[PDB]
């Protein structure tokens, strides 16, 4: 009744360590069937340990293992036993190959998000601590991506320890770890108490923005929008706005492109006065940037960022840039400007629109490229 | 130490439970308890002594915290052991159950003592002699303790963190680190850690700004000479290049570009060709080759140089079986596309410039078209030959010369290149409706009149060439006619002056007669006479003697008699006296026969003159 039907499962288990990689992959794909044939207790005790201890295969097999383990909770007995999936994934998170360890981090996040608070405290915090203190850089890179899972349910002592650990990771001697810390900074900060958001998270952000490598600084600057959306206007102006202003005139066009993308979002956060004194000159410089990509990014938003502005300030500062952009050399710049320039008819008001926007509208109407025309003609 | 000092510690008793409790009630300092306990004379066996836990418990009791007890114990210990020796003893004690907790506490206090002195992890690397482990560093019993201190220092000094790879590099150079790792991966006990440290080394090189150029020598790729693609260091270098490109998007340089930095085309291309032949490097080589071709196309490199670089100038007779021929043909096609006639470099031009003439290429094509795996490439090469002939508006006789068919001789009709000649003839005639050429034009250019006539006559006797030879003989007659050949000149050209004897059975003479009849058939002002040519060539006596001789042979009797009558008429018109005629006649006949020929001659002489 049982032996004959499950003989094929035994064959799959045997093929788990077959010479041919295709059969190993197939057995990995049928891990749930093998676990059901085994039973929960012994999926926990034979199968998961086998996956943990036999991990020297090709990257395809390891990636498949990470994928399968990410959705393997029911086959180990449910949430109460979800923690037994952590060890193997942890090992997979230390693999150098990017796809494997990134999938392992994603699966760790899935399992943790399904885990319940007592189990998080009992196992996931220790997992995060081990990864953060790992002697291999891949482990610390992976650790940067699981802090937000463990932080919310941790006790206050563990929360302080985790803030210190993330600060250390931001300070890491290996640049890739610092890049991962910058990448996950905003998302971890979303889980931190207001009190510590404005002291510890700010320290991490400012350390990253002063990092010696270009890539770390670029990644840190990318998080300005998220951090500002998480902060009070006071601290936003004090901490993030100067970074935006400084990097708007960085020699790297990619950093300036990032800043141009985030300016309008930061405008709401800082308020009208700081936007007038601080954001407007940076936006003007980005609109008149040396690189066409930055000019495109800024032109796509002149309307949004004039809508919040005083029409006096808009007319004085933004319109000259809009004029030059209308006669810009790049067809893509002209297209981006035209796709949003019409939206300023109501914001400026008939009196100002007539003196300033009329000629640009007609010029864009008679453009040499159907892109610009269509962009201005469709939204009439 | 001294004699009889040993045989008094026999008598001197162990303190015991009561003595410990009395000391504790009197607050005897732990150092004192240590000295009276027998732990002065243990040295590196201190932690293995049964009385060590007793002293540890006492010192813990006297203190308030675990840290204070550990600090007092360490102070008692940091004045009796060196840092290395104490660390080694602690590490050994940590692997044992009874002493694990106390050893860990002592290590914690020890690391705090080092940290308060602000000895960096580099300083403790020096203290542990990890400078001196060399190839065995990964097996050092103090490496784990150093790693623990490194983690603690990184925790307490986030602004000044370090790594094992960085310290190893600082004290061993990139070279010592590389060879340490190489040695460590030969022992299975240290292989995994060595691989991890190799990855760490790549990350460190990226951190220190090293470019792929520097890591080329750092991986010792130069040490592989011309066989670098086979090295695992090459795979590491490719991984490094991917990392670097991700870090430096605008300074992104491909693998082939850096290989060009370290190799010029002349040596790099052969490396790619050889690697392409090897299955294990087949893929990588292919990709590099692909990139190389694109890069030549961007540089507009001549297909002749591409031919040389791919080693095709070495192929010789095996050119069509060379695996790189298809790639070179494709590159040449890409190079010439959108170029004009004067600016393009064609396959035939490269072949000739490389000293592989048309006949050699054609022979290689003929051989390769029989082999199924080279048939397609052979047909492409044949198309290249025909395109080359057509572009310069070669006539069929030009192509006949290009195939060296003038050097083949008798068997030219059976040569495999004769098919190419006739194929081009058909093509050219179809493409020139007003200027059609004949199949004999090439042969006439390549061979002179007598040689060509003899060749055709010989081929006519072979059944496989009889039809073609007959057609070509007629064509040759027409060719002579179109060229205004005087029959008497042609007689000389055919070397028919050699002998009057048997000329009436000479096949070459028959061909000449065919031409003479054709020449007379198209209305010359003066109908050409056979007897005139014979007399001019051999003289009256020789011709008359030959006619007398030939009249006795049934196969030539009729023609000989006709010619003799014509000769008599010729003598009559030139007013030859009967005495001269008799003198001529009796060089080849008797008195009576000569008499009757003389009388006939006199009769028709009288008829003409009298």
UniProtKB/Swiss-Prot annotation, chain A:
HEAT repeats, residue ranges: 1-40, 42-78, 79-117, 156-194, 195-233, 234-272, 273-311, 313-350, 351-380
Gene Ontology CC: cytosol; nucleus; peroxisome
Keyword annotations from UniProtKB, A to Z: Acetylation, Cytoplasm, Nucleus, Peroxisome, Repeat
UniProt keyword annotation of ATP-binding present: no
Predominant localisation class: cytoplasm
Distribution of this protein across tissues and organs: Ubiquitous, with higher levels in roots and flowers (at protein level).
UniProt GO BP: regulation of phosphorylation
Signal peptide, first to last residue: none
Superkingdom as given in the UniProt entry: Eukaryota
Entry's localization field: Cytoplasm, Cytosol; Nucleus; Peroxisome
Record's comment describing the protein's domains: Each HEAT repeat appears to consist of two alpha helices joined by a hydrophilic region, the intrarepeat loop. The repeat units may be arranged laterally to form a rod-like structure.
Assembly and interaction partners: PP2A consists of a common heterodimeric core enzyme, composed of a 36 kDa catalytic subunit (subunit C) and a 65 kDa constant regulatory subunit (subunit A), that associates with a variety of regulatory subunits such as subunits B (the R2/B/PR55/B55, R3/B''/PR72/PR130/PR59 and R5/B'/B56 families). Interacts with B'THETA. Interacts with SRK2E/OST1. Interacts with SIC/RON3.
Similarity section: Belongs to the phosphatase 2A regulatory subunit A family.
Job description of the protein: The A subunit of protein phosphatase 2A serves as a scaffolding molecule to coordinate the assembly of the catalytic subunit and a variable regulatory B subunit. Involved during developmental process such as seedling and floral developments. Seems to act as a negative regulator of PP2A catalytic activity. Associates with the serine/threonine-protein phosphatase PP2A catalytic subunit C and regulatory subunit B' to positively regulates beta-oxidation of fatty acids and protoauxins in peroxisomes by dephosphorylating peroxisomal beta-oxidation-related proteins.
Name of this protein: Serine/threonine-protein phosphatase 2A 65 kDa regulatory subunit A beta isoform
Organism field: Arabidopsis thaliana
Curated annotation (Swiss-Prot), chain B:
Induction / repression: Expressed at specific infection stages in a transient manner. Is not expressed until 24 hours post-infection (hpi) but quickly reaches the maximum expression level at approximately 36 hpi. The abundance of transcripts exhibits a more than twofold decrease at 48 hpi.
Keyword vocabulary terms for this entry: Glycoprotein, Repeat, Secreted, Signal, Virulence
Annotated segments matching region 7 X 93 AA tandem repeats: 19-610
Record bears the keyword Secreted: yes
Spans traversing the lipid bilayer: none
Xref: InterPro entries: PexRD54_WY (IPR054463)
WY repeats by residue range: 19-66
GO CC terms: extracellular region; host cell
Free-text comment on this protein's domains from its UniProt entry: The RxLR-dEER motif acts to carry the protein into the host cell cytoplasm through binding to cell surface phosphatidylinositol-3-phosphate. The C-terminal region (residues 79 to 670) consists of seven imperfect tandem repeats, including one W-Y motif (WY1) and six L-W-Y motifs (LWY2 to LWY7). WY1 forms a 3 alpha-helix fold with one hydrophobic core and each L-W-Y motif forms a highly conserved fold consisting of 5 alpha-helices. The units contribute differently to the virulence since WY1, LWY2 and LWY6 are important for the ability to suppress the biogenesis of small RNA in host and virulence activity of the pathogen, whereas LWY3, LWY4, LWY5 and LWY7 are dispensable for PSR2 function.
Self-association state and partner proteins as the record states: Interacts with host dsRNA-binding protein DRB4.
Function statement: Secreted effector that possesses RNA silencing suppression activity by inhibiting the biogenesis of small RNAs in the host plant to promote enhanced susceptibility of host to the pathogen during infection. Interferes with secondary siRNA production by associating with host dsRNA-binding protein DRB4. Inhibits the host salicylic acid pathway during infection.
This protein's name: RxLR effector protein PSR2
């Amino acid at each position: 009744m049982i032996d004959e039907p499950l003989y094929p499962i035994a064959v799959l288990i045997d093929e788990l360590k077959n010479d041919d990689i295709q059969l190993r992959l197939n057995s990995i794909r049928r891990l749930s069937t093998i676990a059901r044939a085994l039973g929960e207790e012994r999926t926990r005790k034979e199968l998961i340990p086998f996956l943990s201890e036999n991990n020297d295969d090709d990257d395809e097999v390891l990636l498949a293992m990470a994928e399968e383990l990410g959705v393997f909770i029911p086959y180990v007995g449910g949430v109460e036993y979800a923690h037994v999936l952590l060890p193997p994934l942890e090992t997979l998170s230390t693999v150098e190959e990017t796809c494997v360890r990134e999938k392992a981090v994603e699966s760790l996040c899935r399992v943790g998000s399904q885990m319940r608070e007592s189990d998080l405290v009992d196992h996931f915090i220790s997992l995060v601590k081990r990864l953060a203190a790992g002697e291999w850089f891949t482990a610390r890179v992976s650790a940067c991506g699981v802090f937000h899972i463990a932080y919310p349910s941790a006790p206050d002592m563990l929360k302080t320890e985790l803030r210190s650990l993330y600060t250390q990771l931001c300070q890491d001697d290996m640049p890739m770890v610092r890049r991962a810390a910058a990448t996950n900074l905003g998302k971890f900060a979303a889980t931190v108490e207001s009190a510590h958001l404005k002291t510890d998270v700010m320290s991490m952000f400012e350390d990253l923005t002063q990092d010696d490598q270009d890539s770390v600084r670029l990644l840190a600057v990318e998080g300005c929008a998220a951090l500002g959306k998480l902060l009070e206007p006071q601290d936003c102006v004090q901490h993030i706005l100067p970074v935006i202003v400084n990097f708007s005139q960085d020699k790297s066009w990619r950093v300036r492109y990032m800043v141009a993308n985030q300016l309008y979002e930061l405008c709401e956060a800082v308020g009208p006065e700081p936007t007038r004194t601080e954001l407007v000159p940076a936006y003007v410089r980005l609109l008149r940037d040396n690189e066409a990509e930055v000019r495109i990014a800024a032109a796509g938003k002149v309307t949004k960022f004039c809508r919040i502005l005083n029409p006096e300030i808009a007319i004085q500062h933004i319109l000259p840039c809009v004029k030059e952009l209308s006669s810009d050399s790049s067809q893509h710049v002209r297209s981006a400007l035209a796709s949003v320039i019409m939206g300023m008819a109501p914001v400026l008001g008939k009196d100002a629109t007539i003196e300033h926007l009329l000629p640009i509208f007609l010029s864009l109407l008679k453009d040499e490229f159907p892109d610009v025309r269509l962009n201005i003609i469709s939204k009439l | 130490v001294p004699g009889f000092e040993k045989l008094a510690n026999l008598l001197k008793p162990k303190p015991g439970l009561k003595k410990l409790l009395k000391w504790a009630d009197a607050k005897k300092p732990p150092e004192t308890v240590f000295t009276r306990l027998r732990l002065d004379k243990t040295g590196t066996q201190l932690f293995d002594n049964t009385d060590f836990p007793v002293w540890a418990a006492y010192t813990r009791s006297v203190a308030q915290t675990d840290s204070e007890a550990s600090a007092v114990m360490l102070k008692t210990l940091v004045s009796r052991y060196s840092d290395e020796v104490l660390s080694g003893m602690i590490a050994a004690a940590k692997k044992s159950s009874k002493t694990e907790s106390i050893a860990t506490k002592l290590e914690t206090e020890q690391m705090r003592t080092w940290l308060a002195a602000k000895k960096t992890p580099d300083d403790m690397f020096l203290v542990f002699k990890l400078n001196k482990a060399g190839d065995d560093i990964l097996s050092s019993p103090l490496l784990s303790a150093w790693t623990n201190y490194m983690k603690l220092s990184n925790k307490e000094n986030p602004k000044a963190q370090t790594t094992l790879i960085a310290t190893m590099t600082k004290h061993y150079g990139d070279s010592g680190v590389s060879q340490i790792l190489a040695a460590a991966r030969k022992s299975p006990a240290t292989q995994s850690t060595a691989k991890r440290l190799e990855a760490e080394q790549v990350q460190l090189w990226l951190k220190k700004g090293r470019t792929p150029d520097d890591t080329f020598t750092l991986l010792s790729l130069d040490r592989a000479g011309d066989d670098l693609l086979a090295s695992p260091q090459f795979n590491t270098w490719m991984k490094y290049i991917n990392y670097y490109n991700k870090e430096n998007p605008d300074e992104k340089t491909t693998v082939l570009a850096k290989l060009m930095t370290h190799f010029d085309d002349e040596e790099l291309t052969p490396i790619l060709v050889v690697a392409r032949k090897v299955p294990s490097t087949e893929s990588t080589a292919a990709k590099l080759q692909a990139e190389q071709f694109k890069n030549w196309l961007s540089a507009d490199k001549s297909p002749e140089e591409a031919f040389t670089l791919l080693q095709l100038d070495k192929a010789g007779d095996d050119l069509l079986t060379n695996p790189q021929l298809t790639n070179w043909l494709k590159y040449t096609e890409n190079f010439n596309l959108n170029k004009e006639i004067n600016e393009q470099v064609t396959a035939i031009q490269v072949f000739r410039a490389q000293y592989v003439d048309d006949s050699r290429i054609a022979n290689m094509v003929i051989a390769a078209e029989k082999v199924p795996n080279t048939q397609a490439i052979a047909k492409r090469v044949e198309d290249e030959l025909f395109k080359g002939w057509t572009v310069v508006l070669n006539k069929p006789d030009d192509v006949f010369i290009n195939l060296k068919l003038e050097t083949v001789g008798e068997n030219v009709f059976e040569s495999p290149l004769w098919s190419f000649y006739t194929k081009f003839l058909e093509k050219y005639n179809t493409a020139n409706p007003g200027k059609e050429q004949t199949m004999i034009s090439g042969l006439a250019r390549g061979y002179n009149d007598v040689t060509l006539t003899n060749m055709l006559l010989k081929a006519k006797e072979a059944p496989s060439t009889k039809t073609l030879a007959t057609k070509l003989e007629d064509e040759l007659v027409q060719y002579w006619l179109a060229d205004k050949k005087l029959p008497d000149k042609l007689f000389g050209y055919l070397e028919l002056k050699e002998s009057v004897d048997g000329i009436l059975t000479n096949p070459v003479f028959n061909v000449w007669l065919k031409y003479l009849n054709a020449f007379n058939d198209k209305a010359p002002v003066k109908k050409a006479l056979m007897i005139d040519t014979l007399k001019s060539a051999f003289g009256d006596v020789a011709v008359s003697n030959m006619l007398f001789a030939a009249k006795k042979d049934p196969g030539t009797a009729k023609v000989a008699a006709t010619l003799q009558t014509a000769l008599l008429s010729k003598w009559v018109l030139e007013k030859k006296t009967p005495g001269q005629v008799s003198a001529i006649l009796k060089e080849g006949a008797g008195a009576d026969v000569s008499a009757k020929l003389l009388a006939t001659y006199s009769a028709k002489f009288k008829v003409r003159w009298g």
